[PDB]
Structure formats: C-alpha cells, structure tokens
UniProtKB/Swiss-Prot annotation:
Membrane topology category: Lipid-anchor
Organism: Homo sapiens (Human)
Assigned keywords, A-Z: Autophagy, Cytoplasm, Cytoplasmic vesicle, Cytoskeleton, Lipoprotein, Membrane, Microtubule, Mitochondrion, Phosphoprotein, Ubl conjugation, Ubl conjugation pathway
Recorded family membership: Belongs to the ATG8 family.
Name assigned to this protein: Microtubule-associated protein 1 light chain 3 beta
Subunit structure: 3 different light chains, LC1 (a cleavage product of MAP1B), LC2 (a cleavage product of MAP1A) and LC3 (produced by one of the MAP1LC3 genes), can associate with the MAP1A or MAP1B heavy chains. Interacts at microtubules with CABP1 (via EF-hands 1 and 2) but not with calmodulin. Interacts with FYCO1 (via C-terminus). Interacts with TP53INP1 and TP53INP2. Interacts with TBC1D25. Directly interacts with SQSTM1; this interaction leads to MAP1LC3B recruitment to inclusion bodies containing polyubiquitinated protein aggregates and to inclusion body degradation by autophagy.
Known outcome of mutating residue 34 to Y: Increased interaction with WDFY3/ALFY, no effect on SQSTM1-binding
C-alpha cells in the first residue's frame, strides 16, 4: 500500500544477549546490593503482534508484592486498559495463584542463572 514496511534486525532475547556467566554475576551483584529486591526479566512473547514492547528488560521488584500487583504494574507501564487481553508466564508456566508473594515465586521458579523470567502475550497459547 502507501506504507513502506521496514523488516529490520531480528529480536534477540535477554539470554541471547548475555552469557550465562554474565547473568549469574548480574544477579550476584544486585542481590548483595538490594537483598529485598527480586531480579526479574520481563519480555514480550516472540510472535506477539498485539501488545507493545517495554523500554526496559531488567526489573527490580520489591519482595513483598504479589503477582496480581506485579501484573497490574506491568499493564500500566504498557499503558493498556483493564480491557485488553493479557497473559503472563513465569518460568514458562501458566501464571500461578495471583495472591502468591513474589518472594515465594522467586524461590520456586527462578532460573538457574538466578533471574526470574517472565513473558507476556495477548493469547494464553504462546
């Protein structure tokens, strides 16, 4: 049509951009400095065509918050209504009980590198 569609370079994930050793060190440093914060990686699902992208990838989340509170925070930062379809994965798993405090989620769902990985999409499929 009237639009020139730029293809551009491919999207690379956080794990593709940093070595396992770098990420282990990243977590190590941040946990020593901010013991009450949870190191969270938040990314958009790879084939997502409806939701916008965040400006950051690495998040420090206060350990007392629950998943419900975090979900809403991410939603607001994506500037979505409470109307838009929105699903969140943690460690590749369907979202756990939303009242679970992230301190507990971290201990059970953190990656081997020490990060807690989250992925968002507009469908529950991914």
């Amino acid at each position: 049509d009237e639009w020139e569609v730029i293809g551009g370079p491919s999207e690379k994930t956080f794990k593709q951009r940093r070595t396992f050793e770098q990420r282990v060190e990243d977590v190590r440093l941040i946990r020593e400095q901010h013991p009450t914060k949870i190191p969270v990686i938040i990314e958009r699902y790879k084939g997502e065509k409806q939701l916008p992208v965040l400006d950051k990838t690495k998040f420090l989340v206060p350990d007392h918050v629950n998943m419900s509170e975090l979900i809403k925070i991410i939603r607001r930062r994506l500037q979505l209504n409470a109307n838009q379809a929105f699903f969140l994965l943690v460690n590749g798993h369907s979202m756990v009980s939303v009242s679970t405090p992230i301190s507990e989620v971290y201990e059970s769902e953190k990656d081997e590198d020490g990060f807690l990985y989250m992925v968002y999409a507009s469908q529950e499929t991914f």
